[PDB]
Amino acid sequence: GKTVLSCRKGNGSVYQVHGHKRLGPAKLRILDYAERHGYMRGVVKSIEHEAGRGAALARVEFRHPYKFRRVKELMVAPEGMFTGQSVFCGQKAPLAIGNVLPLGQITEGCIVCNVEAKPGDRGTLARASGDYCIIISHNHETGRTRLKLPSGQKKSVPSTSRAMIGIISGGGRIEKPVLKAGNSFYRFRGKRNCWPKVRGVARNPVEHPHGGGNHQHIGHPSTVSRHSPPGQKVGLIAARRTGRIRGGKAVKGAWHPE
Amino acid sequence: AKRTVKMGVMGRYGTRYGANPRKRAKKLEVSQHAKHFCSFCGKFAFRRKAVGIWRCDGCSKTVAGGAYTLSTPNNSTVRSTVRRLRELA
RNA sequence: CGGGGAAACCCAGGUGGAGGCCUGUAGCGAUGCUGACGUGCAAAUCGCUCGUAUGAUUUGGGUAUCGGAGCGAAAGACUCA
RNA sequence: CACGAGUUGUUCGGAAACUGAGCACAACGUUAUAUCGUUUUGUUAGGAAAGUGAAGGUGUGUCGGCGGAGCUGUUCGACUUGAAAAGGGGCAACAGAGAACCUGGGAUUAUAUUCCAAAAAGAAAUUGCAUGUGGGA
RNA sequence: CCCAACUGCAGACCGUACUCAUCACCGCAUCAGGUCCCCAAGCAUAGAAUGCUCUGGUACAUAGAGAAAGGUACACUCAGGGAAGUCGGCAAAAUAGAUGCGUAAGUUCGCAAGAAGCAUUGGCUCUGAGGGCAAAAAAUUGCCAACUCAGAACUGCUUACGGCGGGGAAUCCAACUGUAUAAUUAAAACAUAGGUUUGU
RNA sequence: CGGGUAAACGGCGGGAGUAACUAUGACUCUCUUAAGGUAGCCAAAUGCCUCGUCUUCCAAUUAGAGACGCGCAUGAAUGGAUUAAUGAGAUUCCCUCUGUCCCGAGUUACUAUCUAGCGAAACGACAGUCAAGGGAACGGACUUGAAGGGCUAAGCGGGGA
RNA sequence: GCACCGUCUAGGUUUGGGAGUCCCCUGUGGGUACCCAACCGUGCUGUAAACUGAACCAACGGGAUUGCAGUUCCGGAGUCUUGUUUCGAGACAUCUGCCAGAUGGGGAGUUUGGCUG
RNA sequence: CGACGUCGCUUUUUGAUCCUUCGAUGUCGGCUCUUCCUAACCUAGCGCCGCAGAAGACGCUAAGGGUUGGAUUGUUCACC
RNA sequence: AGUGGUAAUGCGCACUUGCCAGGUAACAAAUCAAUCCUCCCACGGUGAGCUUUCUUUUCACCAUAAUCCACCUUGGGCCUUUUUACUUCGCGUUGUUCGGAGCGGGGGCUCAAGAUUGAAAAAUGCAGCUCUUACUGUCAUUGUUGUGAGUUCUGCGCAUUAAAGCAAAAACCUGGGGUGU
RNA sequence: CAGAGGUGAAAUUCUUAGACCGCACCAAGACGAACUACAGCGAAGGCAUUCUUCAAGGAUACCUUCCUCAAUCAAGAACCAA
Ligand SMILES: C#CCOc1ccc(C[C@H]2NC[C@H](O)[C@H]2OC(C)=O)cc1
Ligand SMILES: [K+]
Ligand SMILES: [K+]
Ligand SMILES: [K+]
Ligand SMILES: [K+]
Ligand SMILES: [K+]
Ligand SMILES: [K+]
Ligand SMILES: [K+]
Ligand SMILES: [K+]
Ligand SMILES: [Mg+2]
Ligand SMILES: [Mg+2]
Ligand SMILES: [Mg+2]
Ligand SMILES: [Mg+2]
Ligand SMILES: [Mg+2]
Ligand SMILES: [Mg+2]
Ligand SMILES: [Mg+2]
Ligand SMILES: [Mg+2]
Ligand SMILES: [Mg+2]
Ligand SMILES: [Mg+2]
Ligand SMILES: [Mg+2]
Ligand SMILES: [Mg+2]
Ligand SMILES: [Mg+2]
Ligand SMILES: [Mg+2]
Ligand SMILES: [Mg+2]
Ligand SMILES: [Mg+2]
Ligand SMILES: [Mg+2]
Ligand SMILES: [Mg+2]
Ligand SMILES: [Mg+2]
Ligand SMILES: [Mg+2]
Ligand SMILES: [Mg+2]
Ligand SMILES: [Mg+2]
Ligand SMILES: [Mg+2]
Ligand SMILES: [Mg+2]
Ligand SMILES: [Mg+2]
Ligand SMILES: [Mg+2]
Ligand SMILES: [Mg+2]
Ligand SMILES: [Mg+2]
Ligand SMILES: [Mg+2]
Ligand SMILES: [Mg+2]
Ligand SMILES: [Mg+2]
Ligand SMILES: [Mg+2]
Ligand SMILES: [Mg+2]
Ligand SMILES: [Mg+2]
Ligand SMILES: [Mg+2]
């Protein structure tokens, strides 16, 4: 046979990110000494759109804590952030939308975004538009904070990890029907080369396991094992169930005993 | 005189794409092109300049919020919760 | 901007110039004549006819992905007849 | 076909001298084998890759003021103590960025914003050095 | 030592001919194929349609003689009938611009629709309407430019350049715009928006 | 081994009797499956029989449409049914229109044709009139007959399997 | 056992101690309301609803070499290091190699009789 | 005209065979055009009949001449 | 050791790459106005064509490069003043607007496009010709209108459908500090 | 530790892989028992924990105000358990 398309994309080549016209990675400011013991005051300078990303981005100007210069960090803007707003990041920052606080300084039930999975990773959770985390509780004995992720999973992280108060801007994007192939064309123009999508049963058997036949059909079950090698692992990978979901959509992902 | 009966801005699509998908998009299309109240400066001059970006013509302020409306309903509740939790401390 | 109405709102004129909208050049294609030619002008061309022609549009240069591999809106198509 | 000629630039295009999609020298790692891999999400490499230099001190040269051509102190350029500057060297656009000239000619067989000579047919614009004048030091 | 207006001297390197195509490049060739950019006149006309023309270019593509049959054509016509032809209306014929009136079922209310259908159109000589600027009920007084539309009388047609939809009633398939077997298949195939599922 | 899962792959019955004429079978019995095809749709681009049967369209209908359904072998995201608009998609009918036809005729340009100049290729065992006969069962050669004076121009498609 | 290494602090609360309102015109200008100790605290001069500012290349004070100025150190700017850059995890993990077994058309190689009206 | 039987002819059907052709003999149908056969539909004669007439049946000699336009179907056939 | 104006900002006022901050480079639809130029008119000069008859006619030409000096038309931003500017409002576009977060009016500041005067520059170019050969001299002309039609230069962007929001850098410019002090 | 569930009686079902039962907890979504009545509020539909809030609504009180502004209705409009 021939290499399946899903495996061909692992080489990169013409399937990589369209990174041109992007402003760069969006991150919180570095977890420095001022963040750990006091706070840093920044000014929102602009709210900008980046190609391929639904959420708005914010350019926040800080003073250098050690040198005579400005920093101008770029982070994912929560909803309601505006130009000229003062942003407080650190241990002593007040609980307000747009401020970045240690998770241990945030009350139960507060809605947070841009959450650090590990302390100092500059924000890795709840970053897509309209997404947020909910703080369940803190445990002062082990210094861990429990939060509910946007997918419904519950995760515990160190209390020293930082979170931004609020929800990510740009919510409701998916609720507008696209209505046109051309509109899908422009949506993926800024992301990567992954559209349009050709069905596996529409390909030839040399290319896909689903290809071939005098009728367009999958002649074998489409649920495949987790251990199947690349090129064989197409269809519904390691599916626990199939068909219409009735009476409640269970939380997807792998079970974590914590 | 009124130029269409049922569809408004959706009349640019002619007979394509189906009535129900057009109706669902019409509600967001109308809101994303409308003037929203600016809490600053007290004007109805907020316009969308990209998905999630709103700039007021009156005071030139730029605000991040909502793909097709200035403020999502979830943000209004979140704003109230944060202020409530701030007063509790 | 007229005309109605208690209200909700409705009916009339104009302005404006939207659209993977229509007719139609260039451009990009190739439906039929199963036309011409078929030791051809041509190892695929010619004529008329025909599709589309603000868009998922056409095009120059540069750059990136290849041989059991590449690439493919998927015809086993294309990768210097 | 044979013989003999023709292409003239401070300003035109390129380079000197920009970055882009990208490339891959060094470095490191890998491979029996480098003819392999990483090398722009601000950016090489377990990684000591800056030879550049504020300010001073110390001499020289151009000045200044003071009191008695010299003396002290002082300004600014040359020669000899070390703040701060993280992230090696390069290529990739003759349609992107950049770029100080443009008319007349009786000036050719053929080149010309490229040739024309004192009435330059002429009128300019720009760099790099200098000299003198004017003014500050 | 540093500024201003001058002035003096010096401004290095490579490219530069010609071509860019129905003869200069690729296609074995001076091959009706292919090949990016700039400047682009007059009249008709909606006009980069099409037709003809000043400037510039060209008469180079083997010619002469010349009503055999049979051919090819970016050439026509045909009485009476009018699809009886043929697998099949293939091919050809047909419609035709502009303006006024008018237009069904169905429908996602957007369309269908140029639906279908009637009518007018020339040339001449006129008449109205549609403006600008200037001057102390200026609701007038002067001067003047570009055109368009409408309405009359008179006078015509041999229906007469080019260009330019035939229409209607239904079934099957695919929603649609698109893509796609370079060189026998453009489709109902692929894509598509929409829907669902899986892993995380 | 024990649970889950079909918008996973897929699958979704047979016989017998029965209603005041007859037919039919609401009803009943019985054999059996994981479940026995539900809503719908159809001689459909899916029906063998098959040019099914009825109505309509025609003077005449293996065609088209509308009905019917024991469906060889229809059927629900292996998506079912419907559907305005759209289509160089497949099909039937009507108006218009015509050299498509009855049934052909006339004309034009460029050829063919003749000339000047120039000048190939394919193909080529040897050759080249027939009848019958036998024969490797379909001869240009052989047998027996019948033809046949030689050389040429333009055509033509019977043969040269 | 004792003693050394080995120690300094913002701020908060409350125990001892000593020690200096004045000029110019009701107004204006300048200036004084401190140190020590204990307890907590733990390295702490700014914000507790947000709408866009500036901040560098130190003043200053001591100790030496009235005041003032040179060359200096000292602190202003706490000190120390049985040493890890910091954080999370952690002697497990597939983290590294080796051995072993299942699964494995993803892929490779090969085969898929004969007679025959 | 002809049951039960029986003797033939033909090569316009299919089957049987595998002689020719697999370094290739262009496949169905239609269109067009010519010729040939006769087992005679019409046209010329002639017999016979359950032959009155009319219309027909059967048979003989004779292939000179003629043998149509359409709907459906790719059809050959078929049917109207 | 800069300086004027209430102000918008004006003036020919030193050094700054130690350092820092901004800007230019730097991007964008459509509508409507439209530049240089092109084409048409109108009027007028010069030469040629037609001229049995007509034709105050037909055709051609009537050109002004960079670089500089001086300084009324439109469009935008802004300043000052009057703001008793919006109670059953006003200004403006073809067009979707705008205003006590300061509309309109008076007077101004500034930016961008162009007028206009002049230097260059007639000494050039073009056409016809006198003289008489030398690719000779002499001489004549040497233009303006157009509410005409085109024309993307420009006005024009925080500037387009947008789940599309439209490169970067060198180089340069200005300021904040500082130096001069 | 050997049954539990369920019914007229049963069985489908759960259970030594520990069901049922017992105690204190955790999560999530409903609901607001008793008090609850020929009781209250609302135009009807409807409405039941507490606290903090925002607009209303009725009755009563008045030597306030005012001066026929009203009753009921096609058309039209709003609300309306499941
Ligand atoms: C399918 C099928 C049946 O129909 C055919 C049709 C033609 C042929 C070709 C043969 N005919 C004679 C010779 O043997 C071959 O000729 C050639 C040129 O190969 C075979 C079968
Ligand atoms: K793609
Ligand atoms: K298949
Ligand atoms: K693609
Ligand atoms: K390499
Ligand atoms: K395709
Ligand atoms: K054969
Ligand atoms: K007879
Ligand atoms: K238990
Ligand atoms: Mg590869
Ligand atoms: Mg697909
Ligand atoms: Mg296929
Ligand atoms: Mg396969
Ligand atoms: Mg399918
Ligand atoms: Mg399928
Ligand atoms: Mg339009
Ligand atoms: Mg279109
Ligand atoms: Mg079209
Ligand atoms: Mg079309
Ligand atoms: Mg072309
Ligand atoms: Mg052909
Ligand atoms: Mg031929
Ligand atoms: Mg075309
Ligand atoms: Mg290769
Ligand atoms: Mg295939
Ligand atoms: Mg030569
Ligand atoms: Mg030579
Ligand atoms: Mg990388
Ligand atoms: Mg790069
Ligand atoms: Mg590098
Ligand atoms: Mg690195
Ligand atoms: Mg380069
Ligand atoms: Mg080039
Ligand atoms: Mg360039
Ligand atoms: Mg140059
Ligand atoms: Mg030349
Ligand atoms: Mg040259
Ligand atoms: Mg040249
Ligand atoms: Mg050219
Ligand atoms: Mg060549
Ligand atoms: Mg070659
Ligand atoms: Mg043309
Ligand atoms: Mg034209
Ligand atoms: Mg000519």
Ligand SMILES: [Mg+2]
């Ligand atoms: Mg030629």
Ligand SMILES: [Mg+2]
């Ligand atoms: Mg010729």
Ligand SMILES: [Mg+2]
């Ligand atoms: Mg020729």
Ligand SMILES: [Mg+2]
């Ligand atoms: Mg002929």
Ligand SMILES: [Mg+2]
């Ligand atoms: Mg017919």
Ligand SMILES: [Mg+2]
């Ligand atoms: Mg026929």
Ligand SMILES: [Mg+2]
């Ligand atoms: Mg037929």
Ligand SMILES: [Mg+2]
């Ligand atoms: Mg046709």
Ligand SMILES: [Mg+2]
């Ligand atoms: Mg209707």
Ligand SMILES: [Mg+2]
């Ligand atoms: Mg049907």
Ligand SMILES: [Mg+2]
């Ligand atoms: Mg389609």
Ligand SMILES: [Mg+2]
């Ligand atoms: Mg289209």
Ligand SMILES: [Mg+2]
């Ligand atoms: Mg199409």
Ligand SMILES: [Mg+2]
């Ligand atoms: Mg493609």
Ligand SMILES: [Mg+2]
């Ligand atoms: Mg093809």
Ligand SMILES: [Mg+2]
């Ligand atoms: Mg084709």
